[PDB]
Symmetry: C6
Subunit: 258 residues, 6 copies
């Protein structure tokens, strides 16, 4: 899915709009935390029936969310044959101590991370994909930027550690195998694709995150709240593809509406 955009969709018809806009995948979900976050309610896995109905409407990959640590929700979502599971901090966590043991699943998982240690812990548990934790709901791209900058800075700082022994002390504080940390230092990158998520509101934001080194970007239901969802979704996809072409980012950002 590298170079691509994943969109949150709440109905089959939204999925079809996502797919026709250029999305590489869709993320099926009932609500969009938010309306529930400001309310108080527990956020859980969405009904399998609404997910299958989305899977039946497009021919691109479909992802779905489960609660952090909720390995039973994950077993149900795997049995449904979705393409990816997003063990998501947007939903209400089920286990505040243990993430899901992802290497016991066939289906790939994406997890969030706000820094290097977090990202390595998620990968060491078996995450196949990392995304920034962003700041979901708000439309403020700055948390996404903070987290991508932080991982990049931390990687660079580790790379200046001379002692193999100091490196080990770091792996220890992160609670990951030294081999995993060492593999990151030698490649100067996480060993899995890293996508931006949380606060990506405009085409500019999308191109920003790509220019900071993200392999792609998730966008939320904000696309569909806008006065023309097709124009906005197509504009974010173009911007993600042509992320280093100012005249084209200019063209796709012009006259977008509210």
């Amino acid at each position: 899915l590298k170079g691509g955009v994943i969109m949150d969709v709440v109905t089959p018809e939204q999925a079809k709009i996502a797919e026709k806009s250029g999305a590489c995948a869709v993320m099926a979900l009932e609500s969009i935390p938010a309306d529930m976050r400001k309310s108080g309610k527990v956020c859980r896995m969405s009904d399998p029936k609404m997910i299958k109905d989305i899977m039946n409407s497009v021919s691109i990959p479909v992802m779905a969310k489960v609660r952090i640590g909720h390995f039973v929700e994950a077993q149900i979502i795997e049995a449904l044959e979705v393409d990816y599971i997003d063990e998501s901090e947007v939903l209400t966590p089920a286990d505040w101590t243990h993430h899901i043991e992802k290497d016991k699943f066939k289906v790939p998982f994406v997890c969030g991370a706000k820094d290097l240690g977090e990202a390595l812990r998620r990968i060491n548990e078996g995450a196949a994909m990392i995304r920034t934790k962003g700041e979901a709901g708000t439309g403020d791209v700055s948390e996404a930027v903070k987290h991508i900058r932080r991982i990049t800075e931390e990687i660079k700082a580790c790379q200046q550690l001379k002692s193999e022994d100091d490196i080990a002390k770091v792996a220890e504080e992160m609670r990951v195998p030294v081999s995993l940390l060492k593999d990151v230092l030698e490649k100067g990158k996480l060993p899995v694709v890293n996508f931006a998520a949380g606060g990506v509101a405009t085409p500019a934001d999308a191109a920003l995150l790509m220019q900071l080194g993200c392999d792609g970007v998730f966008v939320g239901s904000g696309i569909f709240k806008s006065s023309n969802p097709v124009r906005l979704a197509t504009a974010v996809v173009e911007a993600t593809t042509h992320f280093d072409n100012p005249s084209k980012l200019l063209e796709v950002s012009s006259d977008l509406g509210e």
Copy 2:
């Protein structure tokens, strides 16, 4: 009651539905302590008459709740011949320093615990069943998960202890007899059934708690707030029973409604 679901019920007709659904017992209570607690009211044992009308309505075992330390509520419930007494922290505690001397009753009790010490203190006092404390009323399964996981971890961590004198110190910090803590450590688990309670909202939640090693689960008045109580109650029972079978978990979770 191993491998079962116990359901809170506030009417004879609710109790009948629980029984048709496959519940192994019901808990008779005049009103969930999640409505009035908001208003600031003392929650006590229910009227023996409404407990008796529930008992007359089903042939599965009936439980009832008394306040913590309220051994006279318990004598009264015992004389009524309910099958189990729940000394419950959901009710307003009658004695904040002493729980009931349960080993002086001939009806079995269940008690809450959030960790090992707590479980062992309740067992020492004569509890025949333990249940996690979790968060009653929120529908958030994470408090139940925290407590089962805390108990499991404390057992493991006490199992690591080399010195008999240190084991004895732990028993002392717990205010229980060493021979009780010793027997827990030898067996690797609590000497009575342990049920999850508080926050168990979906079939997936019930199966999560069973795969964490609970022997069964309490569910609250939430069953009866759903559009189809019969469907939800049946689905929770089937998930508790087939707790390690994903395809079955998928099927009972699909098209679950409000």
Copy 3:
């Protein structure tokens, strides 16, 4: 002046009900003091006329309250020839430093106590009767239970002291003659009757406090807010009398309604 039940009454008709239910005394009151503290209001001695009108309506003993330290209220209530004066912390205290000098009155006094020192100081000042303090208004029995348990536990611990100098040092911290503390330690109990008050809402609550060793129980206007007064008042009296009989406790507690 032994055990039984004393009921707060606000009219001659309530007293008549208290009497025919089997109360051993009444406590004449012009208002329920929960209503008024809420207001902000000062609660004082009741108007002598309304106390007198209650005195005329029943042949069992009548008590009335005065504010802590208000010895002129007590001079007036004594002249009225009530049977007991209750120097009561439910009223607004008149003197935060000095309780009334009760040994100067012919009429006997009841005072509240939350621990052993307080009880001995009230007895030392001439109280003829102690009541546990409880939490008045709330219908929550746990404050009464706390205080009865506190007093008991403090007697038991003072009983462990082997040195007479240490016993004297305890008496002195309590501000009471050592011969008074010494008598309690030898006999295992206060030298006057001790009643539970504050939060006795149900027949089970009355019988709980008697099983904890109280000699009797004050009950508030809560009896008269109930759906059926005679029936609740009679149940509380029966439970106070038969405090040790589970099946009778069951019978009087069933179908009590609001």
Copy 4:
């Protein structure tokens, strides 16, 4: 005015009721702080015209209040020829550092005090009369009782000081001449009459304060808020006169109304 009652009056007709009830004096004032205290407004000297109108309506002495430190209000009230000036903490203070220099006036002043040092400072500035500071507005007689007890205890404690040198240290901390403190110790009383004021709501309260050694008592507009002001005012006067006659305090307290 010793043995007497001073009443607050807001109209000539109230003054006439005060006088016919037995008051030894009246205190002329526009408002009764309160309604203004809970509001926020500055309390000041009352209009001279409303004061003269009261002075013209009765033949007993009339007092009036000025703000603490407001020696100009005092000069205006003196020129009006009132009988006593009450430099009053009920009004909004004008000088938080300096009370009025009362010895530069012909008219006598009364001042409040909550303890011995305060009372000596007020007398040393030239106060001819002391009253307790009470807790005005509330009807709670307990602040009045606290303050009279405190002065009495402090006097007694000073009287146990052996060293003339320690006595001097005390005068120094109080900021008064040692001769003044010494005169109090030798007489065992303040050298001026001391009246209770603040919270005297009933005849019992009035008789209480007299039995604690006060030379008289001020009562507020509460008399006139009652359903029969004449009965209540006459009852407080009787009670102040017959302060040690229980059967008469009983008779005057009976059937008083709200």
Copy 5:
């Protein structure tokens, strides 16, 4: 302006009334900073036109206010030829670190001070008149009293200082030249007129501040909220003038109305 009253005025017609009443000057301001400050608004210099219409309406001196540090508001007011500029803390400060360099203007300024240091700093910067700060808008005269009394006391306490080097240290702590502080101490008072302001509500208040040694008094829009502005304004003027004559103070204070 010694021995006079300066009155806040918001219209030409208010100004005329102040002038008939005997005011020595008026202060033109478009709206008292006690209405909007509540709303959270920036209060600035008034429109020069409304200041000019006031100036055209009376032949007594007209003052106007500028923000603290706003030397350009002051240049503008100066070009308008008002008679005095009030650099006022009632307005919203333009420069929280530097007041205006007043000795560079040719129109006299007045400035607030709450103590000596403050007065001397304002004088050093070129203020021709000082006024107490007190509490604008409350009608509480005690802040004005506190400040006049604080200044008087600090002068006395500095007069006690024996060492020229210690005097110099004080001047240094004040951030003013020693020769200025020295001249204050020799003369026993501030080298310019000092007026009371903020809280001056009654004739009695105005005379209080004069007997404390003020040279005159500012009164605010409160004159014009009274039922009879003409009567109140005249009465304050007469009391400022005859500030040490009780019978006259009595007469102007009698029958003053709302």
Copy 6:
């Protein structure tokens, strides 16, 4: 690109007004950012169409804002060929750690600064223009005054340092090349123009900031909320030009109305 006045404009018609009043540039904006922060809202780059429509309506230079760190917004606004880009703290910052690398753009940038370090860091990153930060929205000029005074005062104090090592230590704490700090110390000023922004509400405010040494002044949409826009905008321009002429400042400030 020297001094004068830059006005925020939200429509082509406002720009036309800004131009004919004598503004030296406009700042194209689709909303007033005080309205939106209040909402909670993220403020971003404005839609290129509306900026373009403003560019078409006037022949004076047009600026637009981008979020701090949002270099892709700046890439887009540059492609649009606006005349200046303002990297603006009034918008929601995109990168809390890294301002844009402005020396990589051909279009010149304006940045905010509240002190000398911040100004040098923005210049070091390639800013062509500094503006003081002020408090935007409030109409209160004191934050702008504070920042202009701060920068000045810090230059003057760095000027006192006699040691080159100490000067280097200052540069390093500021995170800027020592040759940059050294140039400011020698010349007594920033090497680029410095404009006041934030809180410039009145003609007097504009002229105040110019007299404090600013080279120009940004003004907000506050001009357009006023009762007469042309007149207020022209007065601000005239005051910025004639900042040193009191009588002209008087003339343009008079009868400005709402």
